[PDB]
């Protein structure tokens, strides 16, 4: 699937990401745009051999199992495929762990590069949430 700024905002809001550990909803939407550009099936194979999955491009060598990364960990304890659903619950929960696992949203460099320190309320401006 390929959400739309607002369509995603809603879903993420519904899944309780708005002000999760202090992170305004805008933060997560903006994060998605720069990671998967809102495409739930987005997947990128990295040279280390891992692969980023879905809307938030979670990496296979750490949070999910894809069976293609030998040393891989599965911190979120789920199959990487899970993060490819058209429903975002998979990524959204895993995301909460990653962030609340003490890592913060700095976990996503994109968030750092493109979202940190930017009026992010803008990614939900004009959305009936």
């Amino acid at each position: 699937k390929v959400f739309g700024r607002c369509e995603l905002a809603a879903a993420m809001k519904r899944h309780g990401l708005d002000n999760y550990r202090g992170y305004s909803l805008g933060n997560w939407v903006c994060a998605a745009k720069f990671e998967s550009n809102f495409n739930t099936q987005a997947t990128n194979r990295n040279t280390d051999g891992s692969t980023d999955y879905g809307i938030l491009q979670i990496n296979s060598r750490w949070w999910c199992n894809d069976g293609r990364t030998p040393g891989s960990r599965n911190l979120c304890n789920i199959p990487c495929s899970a993060l490819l659903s058209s429903d975002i619950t998979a990524s959204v929960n895993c995301a909460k762990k990653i962030v609340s696992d003490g890592n913060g949203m700095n976990a996503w460099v994109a968030w750092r590069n493109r979202c940190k320190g930017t009026d992010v309320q803008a990614w939900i401006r004009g959305c009936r949430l």
Partner: nanobody, 132 residues
């Protein structure tokens, strides 16, 4: 998330010298480990970074080709093998580790290059003096 440093000292021109660093962090990570160095007259410069997990390396054009970073056996221990040493290499070397377990894929070369954004844990340093 404490780092211990070994090796170093004075080596002669064209010589090789091994530096080692073990992140006693003992939790989950670190994600990155690399070295930075600094001469008297000089801002802290990047040397090398290796990606714990995946083992991808990144070097500064200044040491790329000579130096080699890698993971030693011992848990959270990386090793910087400095070869074809030049006096310009004389300086204080600092081990650093990024304790952040990145969600998507991250390359340690980025942080290292850009002044070290990400590297939250630092060593005390080890002096390396390449006697001309």
């Amino acid at each position: 998330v404490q780092l211990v440093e070994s090796g170093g000292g004075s080596v002669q021109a064209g010589g090789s010298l091994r530096l080692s660093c073990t992140a006693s962090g003992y939790t989950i990570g670190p994600y990155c480990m690399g070295w930075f160095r600094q001469a008297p007259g000089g801002e802290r410069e990047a040397v090398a970074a290796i990606n714990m997990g995946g083992g991808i390396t990144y070097y500064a054009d200044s040491v790329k080709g000579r130096f080699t970073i890698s993971r030693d056996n011992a848990k959270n221990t990386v090793t910087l093998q400095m070869n074809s040493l030049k006096p310009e290499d004389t300086a204080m070397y600092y081990c650093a580790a990024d304790s952040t377990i990145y969600a998507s894929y991250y390359e340690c070369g980025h942080g290292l290059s850009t002044g070290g954004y990400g590297y939250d844990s630092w060593g005390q340093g080890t002096q390396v003096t390449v006697s001309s």
